Structures are given as C-alpha cells and as structure tokens.
C-alpha cells in the first residue's frame, strides 16, 4: 500500500485528453512559487529606543513556512483570509535547503535604510519584535555580516537574497515555538534579518510603514513529502 | 540626416549603490580618484610580495596557550591516574586557557593564537586541530602521558584515565623527548561546528564538540641534581583539513583601545553634533556671567545632553570619566567658607541644568571644594529653589579650549 | 664523549671567521627571501658590496640570565634591529665592517649560542 | 622551528574528508574582504566655520587598519562590539600596497556634496576633525587634487576609489599615534579625504548625518605576516 496504490480499478471510460499544463492557458503549472507575499506592518516613533543609532527597528526571523499568524482588526489580510500560498505549501513537507528572496518596502521615510542578515543567530522567535521592546544586544548593527545599505530617495523598495548558511544536512521548516533543541534554533531558520535607519533623527509624526514581501529561490527544495495537516477554509470566516 | 529612434524604452530599476556584501568573483563599479580612468592597479615587484592572506597558511602557525608546572616531588598530584591538563576542543581557545592581561575598569586582553583569531571571524568551522606540547626537561627526566580526545564531552565531571582509554588517545613518552604533537580528530554529529564565542546577540555561548584531556601513566621522575619542576607549554595550530565556514560579527576586537562603556550609568556625553564643547557664556543664563558648556560661538548654541536614564537620582551630580578640558573661573558665599581663587582648573564635576526638553551642563573644577559646591547646586535644583538664589555657580571669565571630542560623565 | 677527542662538531665558515656548533639548530625565516630589484630605482649612484666584510659573522652581545630573574616573559634582550653600534661613550664605528655612509640595505642572519649543562631545564 | 613545525606527530585517525571551502556552502572562503564597514557619525550647523564656502566639513585620514576606536553612548556599534573585520585582519600584518574603496552616505542634505583626496598630506591624525575645530589651511578645497562632485538630488551615496600614491616600497599599517617619523606621516596613510558642501547655505536645523563605509581593493595586499596582538572578546562587554 504505497501512498499511491490502486488495488482493483474499475474505470468505465478512457482518460481525459491530455493537455499540457500550459496549452488552453499559457503557463506551465507545477509546484514552484516566486510569488511575493506580505510579512509585517507599521512602526511609530514611540517604539524605538532612546538612543536609536545603529539600532535596528525590526528583528525578522527567517522561516520558509512564514511567521506565526496573528489576527488583528487593523490588518484584515491575516484575519479574513489566512496566510499566503507559501506557508500552506511548506506544510506538506519536512525539509528545505535553499535561500529566500526578500523584497522590503519602507514608505514613511525619505532617509537611508539598512538591512543585515544574521545566519548563525538562533531563530527562537515566531514573531517580529520592534524597537524598545526588542531584546537588548539584538537590533544592534553588526560589522561583518551580509548587508545592504539603500537610500529611500532613490528607491524605497529593497530586494535582497538571503543565503542558506546552516551547518547541517537539511533545513527544518514548520518548527514549534516555545520550549526546546539544537535543531530548532540553528537548523530551522536561515537566521534573523535586522532592519534599521542610518540616522538617529526622529521618526516623522505620521510614522513609517514597512511591508516585507518574500519568495522562494532556485537552490531551494522541498525535500521530503509529509502528510497534509488539517486546513481551515477562508470562506467560513464570517460565521 | 537626424534619423528618429523609436526604439522601445527599457524598464529599469534604480538603486543607490553596488553590493555591500560581495567581496569576490564579481566586478565593483566605482569612481576611481586617479588621472587614468581605466582598469588601474598598483605596480609591484619582488620587493613587494603577493598578498599573504591564505587562510590555511595563517591558521597553521602555532600559538601559545596557558602553561603549567609539572612537579615530580608532589607526592599527591604526581601519581598514576591524575589529571594534569584538560580543555574543550574547538578552534577558539577557552578564555581560561589563554594568557590574560586584566585591568581595573577596563577590558580583559586575551593573547589568542592564529587559529583562534581567524575562527572568530567566521560563524562555523571544522577540521583536525594540532596541539603541540613542548616540555622544559632534560635527558634525566622520564615519564609517560596519555592524552585523549573525548567526543561529545565538554567537562571533566565524569572524566578519568580509565575512561579516557576508551576513546581516541595517544601515549607519549618523555624519555629524552622535548616536543611532540597530538593532532586531534574532528568527530561531530554534523559537518560544520558553530563557534563557541560570538557577537553579542544572545546571552549564551555555544558549546565545543569535544574535550581533550592529559593524564599520567607513569609519574614524572627526576633526580637530586636536576630540577623537579618541568613547565609544560601547550601550543595550538590548525590541521591540513581545517576549514572556516561563514563570515560573521567578530567575536574579538582590537586591544588598541580597551576603553569601554559598560552597563554602568555613564551620563551620555551630550548629543552627537553637539560636540566638541567649551566653557562659555549665555545671555539667558544670568546675563552671561556664569559658565556653561557651549558647542558654538553663535548665540543659542548651548551643548545639549543626550537621553539621561530615569534611574538616576535627582539630587546627584556628575564626574568626567574620559578626556577633559582646562578652564579659568567665584567669590566667597555668605555663611560658608566656600570661595574659588581665580586660576586655571581641570574640568571634573558638573551639574545638569534643564530648560524645557533640552538639558545642558554646568562646569565645575576638579577640586575637593568644587565637588561640594556642585553637590549643593545639584540639591538646590532638586528642591526648585529660586533662580536668583542658586546664582552664588562658577563665574565666566573667558572662553576655554575646545575638547578633542565627546566628554563622558557619571553620577 | 666516545672518542679520544670530543664528538665531531659541525662548522660554519664565512669570510675571515669560523663558527663551531655541536648540535642540531632551530631555524626560521622572517619573510619570503628574494632579490632586490627596486633599490636600483632609488639611487643614481652605483651600489657597493663588500663580501669579505659584510659576510663575516660578528659577536655583538652576551647576556646572563639567572634563576632568580628567570620568569615567564622575562625579556633578556630587547633592541632595535639592526643596530650594532658600540663605542666608548654612548655614541657607526669604523672599527669593524661598518660604514659611515648615507644609505644601505642588506639581509640579516641571527645566530644564538647558549652553552648549558646536562642537568638544567628551560 | 618554523612558525608551522610539527616535531613528532601522534595522529590516531585519518584526516577529515576534504571539502572545498565552497561545497557544503556555496562561497570560496579565503582571507579577502570587500565587506563595507562604518567610519564616522553626524554633523550640525554649530560645527562649521563662520565662512563655510570651499571649506570641508570632514578631514578623514586614510588608514587600512581603520581609525582609532572611540566608544560613545550615542554610538553603541563601537562600544558593545569592537571595530569591524578589516582592522582586526590588518592587525596580523605589517605592510600594504593597495588603494581603498570608499562609500559615503550623506542624509540630511539635498544639496551638492564634494569629496577630495590628498595623497601627499601627512596622516598624523587618528580621528576625524569637524568644521571650526579643524586645523586651518585644512578642509580648504584644493584645485588639482583627485575629486568627485555629486548632487544629493540624484544619489545620496558616493562611491569612489582612493589610489595608492606613496613614494615608497610599502605602506605601513597599524601606525602609532602621537610622537614621531618620516615613515609615520608619508608612508602610513593614503592621505586625507576632504568632504564638503558646494554651497555656503546654512545647515538644516535637523543637521546632517555622514556615514562613511569602506572596503579593500584588488591591487591591495597584506604583505608580511606578523604575530597577532592580544584581542578583546565582544561577548564580555557587560561585566
């Protein structure tokens, strides 16, 4: 009884005429997605530390299966319809070995923004943390880490590719959250991404809005097929 | 003939700069500050060798670790089975196994070996490690040691000689031999191993994959006409199979400047852009007869202080903890013998004067008398005393020399 | 030792001087040894070489270290190299292959001799 | 006893399987770094001279081993974690012969900025000096020096490459600071870099923030290997 096993088939008809997945439509349909989906919201002045210099504003844990969904009334895109395709696709697999592409949009600022990547940092958070409320010794820009400095006067969307730097055979996706091992902190996430502002100058009254979109890469692979966890229909989100 | 070019525009994405991460196997466009605007590189000769920055070359160089004495007269420690020396096995060296130089209120300096310094520049690592043991003995001395490599262990809580023989080990003889090397393996559950020490990001140091232990097999024996002490000097180098994985935040720093600002409530060195500072006058402060720290000769340019933490006492004054400046400055006060003779003093103490959302600093000479005057001034401001009564604060005689850079303070 | 004479001792001979050794050395090189090519690009004047004088092995100093002063890190000799200028008062002396000339360059070789007993360690 | 010398090896096992430095990861790891690290902070109006025309705002000494670290509370990136990779890499060597790449970011201004390079200027400072407090006859723009004029309306990050113009065999790194020779002022640094503003128009109330990042070049070389000076662990910066 392999996962695909037909003991005695009673097929009354011939098969349906073969299409290619791109004929009566013009694209090849297979399970690969570089479609970009959201990851976070907005920040205000009252969130940042008293000394906001070389201090990151966001601590983003890197998970192929996305972040732990949290419904708000300010953000209906999480509440009325669940998280995007990517985390539901990764829910049917166990391991990954590729890097992720990050597209980041910062709208309330016209001043320079930085983005740094910390591969070896243990991914023990399932939600992004902002400013003052960020753990100390975190959201401090490091020196010798992969980074990208961009001016918002030129372009206010940052596109970078986060590499796969894990000292292991695989990368674990769909990791539990609260209480450990040595496989949940160094082998699950690609690490953390720190987003900060070059200047220590105060945040505009209206505040700043950071929308992080991400996609899969080419050297990325969903290695082992697991059973699908029971899903929730978005169509029944009103009763 | 001015032909039209109706050739479709191309969608292009503007960006401020070229990659900040890329360091090799690519081109980096830049505005060369030269007269020749082509591919230009420094001229060389045999007087000026190629870059000597091969990782395998550097980390192959032997570094010295904390030595220890090996006495043969000790009737207790010099017995069969005793543990003479041990430590975790990893590229970086255990801080307690390194030559240290500590300083009061400063940073501890560690004499790290080539393999350790480089490894602190990379996140993960792997390969065999070469531990060379040098003995300060002569032909008369004689012994045998059993050095082992215990995988999966990081302490000597359950470590003994009769258990070390059950793992990768070597038995060295000390019979007219002063030097030997024990190249320890790389036995790991994984391919690469994370560095034990790293950039401040979490409150926990990672663990080494194994543990090396040196035991006694046949106790050291010397004679009457020979030194009973044989100092042992352990040295470390990386094996030919040693590799370093990913560049990360240095777990080390230079000892050029060991000055640091710990979580100790330093009083914030004004603000950035509001320094250098000098002692000057202010027309809104007692008709510019008293002294305050300015940062500009232009009016309305008083040095503002940064974010003072809310855990500081309101009645407290401050002290310079870094480089300071000299300044010339008060008559005797009623009821007390407090009087400051006209002369040049070194800035030491200070009292914060708040004026709305902006906070400034008032200078005080580094003298036993000045500390008490700033003591009272700090107390008078805490009780909201009349501005005219706190006036008898140092006087303004003339401007003073500017500071090299930011001046630090403390409660 | 084992002969009517002592053991056979190795010899090192340069110009007008001979050094004797009895055991195996311990050696190393500061940096990649080479042949100077940009030095002729610094002086228009013809360079001069004095092999008979410069190739000579010279003894310049002998320091004594006792047990009471022997501690880990104890600096026995700390001088700027190359500076081997010795004169009656603190004042390069013309008494040896040394020249009072403006510029010079050369490669150096340092040999350290120590003669201990069969019963000491350090 | 050369620096690498094994008198009697007792190797119980075979060697570990060889990886290339780029196999279980995808990059070749050798000691070459074009990773960009910070060099300075921000400037205000009260810092500049009364006549701020053709007067530079910053006097940057050019050192491969970086500047002399100075800890501040306004800048934690120097205080909690020491200077970047570059000055710790150059600490194990004695000489250099290449040029440096400078990336400069100016954020509080939308007016034109200039950058000039003075090779023959003696590098006798270990810290940058700003405005009024700059030595006279310095921070005055020169005529026939390598320079680059850039408008902040187009792009607010300047990327230039400073050449190696020393009348000597090598370039000395890790130079002492205070009291001389003829090797410490003309043979150590690549010279000085002057950063000024095209206009004499006053600086905005919020002030301007200049972050200078730099990297090594290709014609650059760390020639002679010296012993490593004792280091300091960044992990012990809280006790």
mmCIF file of N, CA, C and O in Angstrom, chain A residues 50 118-121 137-138 142-145 147-151 154-155 165 167-168 182 186 200, chain B residues 14-17 20-21 123-124 190-195 200-201 206 246-250 272 307:
data_model
loop_
_atom_site.group_PDB
_atom_site.id
_atom_site.type_symbol
_atom_site.label_atom_id
_atom_site.label_comp_id
_atom_site.label_asym_id
_atom_site.label_seq_id
_atom_site.Cartn_x
_atom_site.Cartn_y
_atom_site.Cartn_z
ATOM 1 N N UNK A 50 15.651 55.046 23.230
ATOM 2 C CA UNK A 50 16.059 56.420 23.493
ATOM 3 C C UNK A 50 17.262 56.819 22.647
ATOM 4 O O UNK A 50 17.409 57.981 22.269
ATOM 5 N N UNK A 118 21.752 37.759 9.727
ATOM 6 C CA UNK A 118 22.491 37.005 10.734
ATOM 7 C C UNK A 118 22.155 35.517 10.671
ATOM 8 O O UNK A 118 21.224 35.064 11.332
ATOM 9 N N UNK A 119 22.932 34.754 9.888
ATOM 10 C CA UNK A 119 22.712 33.324 9.645
ATOM 11 C C UNK A 119 22.816 32.462 10.898
ATOM 12 O O UNK A 119 21.965 31.601 11.125
ATOM 13 N N UNK A 120 23.852 32.695 11.698
ATOM 14 C CA UNK A 120 24.121 31.852 12.856
ATOM 15 C C UNK A 120 23.305 32.239 14.083
ATOM 16 O O UNK A 120 23.374 31.564 15.110
ATOM 17 N N UNK A 121 22.530 33.313 13.984
ATOM 18 C CA UNK A 121 21.689 33.713 15.107
ATOM 19 C C UNK A 121 20.547 32.722 15.262
ATOM 20 O O UNK A 121 19.836 32.438 14.298
ATOM 21 N N UNK A 137 21.118 43.750 22.978
ATOM 22 C CA UNK A 137 22.194 43.063 22.254
ATOM 23 C C UNK A 137 21.666 42.482 20.942
ATOM 24 O O UNK A 137 22.373 41.767 20.232
ATOM 25 N N UNK A 138 20.424 42.823 20.619
ATOM 26 C CA UNK A 138 19.796 42.450 19.364
ATOM 27 C C UNK A 138 19.315 43.759 18.785
ATOM 28 O O UNK A 138 19.105 44.720 19.528
ATOM 29 N N UNK A 142 25.662 44.779 13.240
ATOM 30 C CA UNK A 142 26.943 44.112 13.382
ATOM 31 C C UNK A 142 27.871 44.571 12.267
ATOM 32 O O UNK A 142 27.447 45.273 11.347
ATOM 33 N N UNK A 143 29.138 44.192 12.350
ATOM 34 C CA UNK A 143 30.123 44.683 11.397
ATOM 35 C C UNK A 143 30.339 43.771 10.192
ATOM 36 O O UNK A 143 30.255 44.218 9.049
ATOM 37 N N UNK A 144 30.606 42.498 10.452
ATOM 38 C CA UNK A 144 30.982 41.577 9.387
ATOM 39 C C UNK A 144 29.854 40.631 9.002
ATOM 40 O O UNK A 144 30.059 39.422 8.897
ATOM 41 N N UNK A 145 28.663 41.179 8.795
ATOM 42 C CA UNK A 145 27.534 40.381 8.336
ATOM 43 C C UNK A 145 27.050 40.888 6.988
ATOM 44 O O UNK A 145 27.191 42.072 6.675
ATOM 45 N N UNK A 147 25.087 42.519 4.312
ATOM 46 C CA UNK A 147 24.194 43.657 4.460
ATOM 47 C C UNK A 147 23.993 44.421 3.158
ATOM 48 O O UNK A 147 24.675 44.177 2.162
ATOM 49 N N UNK A 148 23.044 45.350 3.186
ATOM 50 C CA UNK A 148 22.741 46.184 2.032
ATOM 51 C C UNK A 148 22.203 47.530 2.499
ATOM 52 O O UNK A 148 21.160 47.606 3.149
ATOM 53 N N UNK A 149 22.927 48.591 2.165
ATOM 54 C CA UNK A 149 22.538 49.944 2.546
ATOM 55 C C UNK A 149 21.876 50.648 1.365
ATOM 56 O O UNK A 149 22.464 50.746 0.289
ATOM 57 N N UNK A 150 20.655 51.136 1.569
ATOM 58 C CA UNK A 150 19.887 51.739 0.482
ATOM 59 C C UNK A 150 19.232 53.068 0.859
ATOM 60 O O UNK A 150 18.640 53.197 1.930
ATOM 61 N N UNK A 151 19.336 54.045 -0.039
ATOM 62 C CA UNK A 151 18.707 55.350 0.156
ATOM 63 C C UNK A 151 17.273 55.361 -0.358
ATOM 64 O O UNK A 151 17.004 54.926 -1.477
ATOM 65 N N UNK A 154 16.275 57.324 -3.669
ATOM 66 C CA UNK A 154 16.491 56.710 -4.972
ATOM 67 C C UNK A 154 15.440 55.645 -5.248
ATOM 68 O O UNK A 154 14.823 55.625 -6.314
ATOM 69 N N UNK A 155 15.242 54.763 -4.275
ATOM 70 C CA UNK A 155 14.269 53.685 -4.391
ATOM 71 C C UNK A 155 13.847 53.225 -3.002
ATOM 72 O O UNK A 155 14.695 52.981 -2.142
ATOM 73 N N UNK A 165 22.877 29.356 5.125
ATOM 74 C CA UNK A 165 24.108 29.067 5.855
ATOM 75 C C UNK A 165 23.848 28.265 7.127
ATOM 76 O O UNK A 165 23.929 28.797 8.235
ATOM 77 N N UNK A 167 24.919 24.690 9.277
ATOM 78 C CA UNK A 167 25.917 23.630 9.424
ATOM 79 C C UNK A 167 25.268 22.259 9.536
ATOM 80 O O UNK A 167 25.580 21.506 10.457
ATOM 81 N N UNK A 168 24.391 21.934 8.594
ATOM 82 C CA UNK A 168 23.649 20.692 8.651
ATOM 83 C C UNK A 168 23.265 20.164 7.285
ATOM 84 O O UNK A 168 23.552 20.777 6.256
ATOM 85 N N UNK A 182 18.621 21.568 19.603
ATOM 86 C CA UNK A 182 19.766 22.076 18.859
ATOM 87 C C UNK A 182 19.405 22.046 17.379
ATOM 88 O O UNK A 182 20.177 22.455 16.511
ATOM 89 N N UNK A 186 19.247 26.384 15.342
ATOM 90 C CA UNK A 186 20.323 26.608 14.390
ATOM 91 C C UNK A 186 20.062 25.901 13.061
ATOM 92 O O UNK A 186 20.694 26.212 12.051
ATOM 93 N N UNK A 200 19.916 58.811 13.384
ATOM 94 C CA UNK A 200 19.313 58.749 14.705
ATOM 95 C C UNK A 200 18.200 59.782 14.783
ATOM 96 O O UNK A 200 17.537 59.923 15.811
ATOM 97 N N UNK B 14 16.160 51.552 -10.461
ATOM 98 C CA UNK B 14 17.218 52.371 -9.859
ATOM 99 C C UNK B 14 17.589 51.934 -8.442
ATOM 100 O O UNK B 14 16.713 51.598 -7.643
ATOM 101 N N UNK B 15 18.887 51.918 -8.154
ATOM 102 C CA UNK B 15 19.394 51.614 -6.817
ATOM 103 C C UNK B 15 20.542 52.561 -6.464
ATOM 104 O O UNK B 15 21.282 52.995 -7.343
ATOM 105 N N UNK B 16 20.692 52.886 -5.170
ATOM 106 C CA UNK B 16 21.712 53.834 -4.705
ATOM 107 C C UNK B 16 23.159 53.369 -4.875
ATOM 108 O O UNK B 16 23.990 54.150 -5.335
ATOM 109 N N UNK B 17 23.462 52.129 -4.503
ATOM 110 C CA UNK B 17 24.841 51.664 -4.523
ATOM 111 C C UNK B 17 24.977 50.214 -4.961
ATOM 112 O O UNK B 17 23.988 49.488 -5.081
ATOM 113 N N UNK B 20 27.119 45.525 -0.990
ATOM 114 C CA UNK B 20 27.921 45.810 0.188
ATOM 115 C C UNK B 20 28.446 44.496 0.748
ATOM 116 O O UNK B 20 29.332 44.475 1.603
ATOM 117 N N UNK B 21 27.882 43.398 0.255
ATOM 118 C CA UNK B 21 28.205 42.067 0.751
ATOM 119 C C UNK B 21 29.265 41.371 -0.101
ATOM 120 O O UNK B 21 30.131 40.667 0.422
ATOM 121 N N UNK B 123 31.570 32.094 11.273
ATOM 122 C CA UNK B 123 30.499 31.519 12.081
ATOM 123 C C UNK B 123 30.728 30.051 12.429
ATOM 124 O O UNK B 123 30.710 29.677 13.601
ATOM 125 N N UNK B 124 30.935 29.219 11.415
ATOM 126 C CA UNK B 124 31.123 27.793 11.650
ATOM 127 C C UNK B 124 32.554 27.387 11.321
ATOM 128 O O UNK B 124 33.321 28.179 10.771
ATOM 129 N N UNK B 190 27.595 16.586 13.079
ATOM 130 C CA UNK B 190 27.353 17.394 11.898
ATOM 131 C C UNK B 190 28.634 17.713 11.143
ATOM 132 O O UNK B 190 29.731 17.333 11.547
ATOM 133 N N UNK B 191 28.468 18.420 10.037
ATOM 134 C CA UNK B 191 29.556 18.718 9.127
ATOM 135 C C UNK B 191 30.383 19.899 9.603
ATOM 136 O O UNK B 191 31.606 19.814 9.698
ATOM 137 N N UNK B 192 29.707 21.000 9.905
ATOM 138 C CA UNK B 192 30.370 22.194 10.409
ATOM 139 C C UNK B 192 29.984 22.457 11.856
ATOM 140 O O UNK B 192 28.892 22.097 12.286
ATOM 141 N N UNK B 193 30.881 23.084 12.609
ATOM 142 C CA UNK B 193 30.607 23.353 14.012
ATOM 143 C C UNK B 193 30.667 24.839 14.330
ATOM 144 O O UNK B 193 31.657 25.504 14.033
ATOM 145 N N UNK B 194 29.587 25.366 14.923
ATOM 146 C CA UNK B 194 29.467 26.774 15.310
ATOM 147 C C UNK B 194 30.543 27.201 16.303
ATOM 148 O O UNK B 194 30.969 26.402 17.138
ATOM 149 N N UNK B 195 30.980 28.450 16.196
ATOM 150 C CA UNK B 195 31.989 28.993 17.096
ATOM 151 C C UNK B 195 31.469 29.073 18.530
ATOM 152 O O UNK B 195 30.301 29.388 18.759
ATOM 153 N N UNK B 200 27.789 39.748 20.361
ATOM 154 C CA UNK B 200 26.688 39.982 21.299
ATOM 155 C C UNK B 200 25.332 39.981 20.595
ATOM 156 O O UNK B 200 25.013 40.922 19.870
ATOM 157 N N UNK B 201 24.550 38.929 20.826
ATOM 158 C CA UNK B 201 23.264 38.723 20.159
ATOM 159 C C UNK B 201 22.351 37.902 21.059
ATOM 160 O O UNK B 201 21.129 37.984 20.977
ATOM 161 N N UNK B 206 27.907 29.146 22.739
ATOM 162 C CA UNK B 206 27.735 27.809 22.175
ATOM 163 C C UNK B 206 28.758 26.845 22.782
ATOM 164 O O UNK B 206 29.705 27.278 23.434
ATOM 165 N N UNK B 246 31.440 30.579 7.480
ATOM 166 C CA UNK B 246 30.729 31.792 7.071
ATOM 167 C C UNK B 246 31.153 33.033 7.853
ATOM 168 O O UNK B 246 31.259 32.986 9.075
ATOM 169 N N UNK B 247 31.338 34.167 7.153
ATOM 170 C CA UNK B 247 31.760 35.399 7.825
ATOM 171 C C UNK B 247 30.664 35.978 8.710
ATOM 172 O O UNK B 247 29.528 36.156 8.267
ATOM 173 N N UNK B 248 31.016 36.271 9.958
ATOM 174 C CA UNK B 248 30.065 36.808 10.920
ATOM 175 C C UNK B 248 30.686 37.914 11.765
ATOM 176 O O UNK B 248 31.853 38.266 11.586
ATOM 177 N N UNK B 249 29.898 38.446 12.695
ATOM 178 C CA UNK B 249 30.349 39.510 13.585
ATOM 179 C C UNK B 249 31.533 39.015 14.396
ATOM 180 O O UNK B 249 31.422 38.005 15.092
ATOM 181 N N UNK B 250 32.674 39.712 14.288
ATOM 182 C CA UNK B 250 33.877 39.338 15.033
ATOM 183 C C UNK B 250 33.590 39.123 16.511
ATOM 184 O O UNK B 250 32.910 39.937 17.136
ATOM 185 N N UNK B 272 25.120 63.871 19.668
ATOM 186 C CA UNK B 272 26.023 63.836 18.532
ATOM 187 C C UNK B 272 25.769 65.037 17.630
ATOM 188 O O UNK B 272 24.641 65.286 17.203
ATOM 189 N N UNK B 307 19.995 61.362 26.113
ATOM 190 C CA UNK B 307 18.956 60.776 26.945
ATOM 191 C C UNK B 307 19.478 60.314 28.302
ATOM 192 O O UNK B 307 20.102 59.258 28.413
#
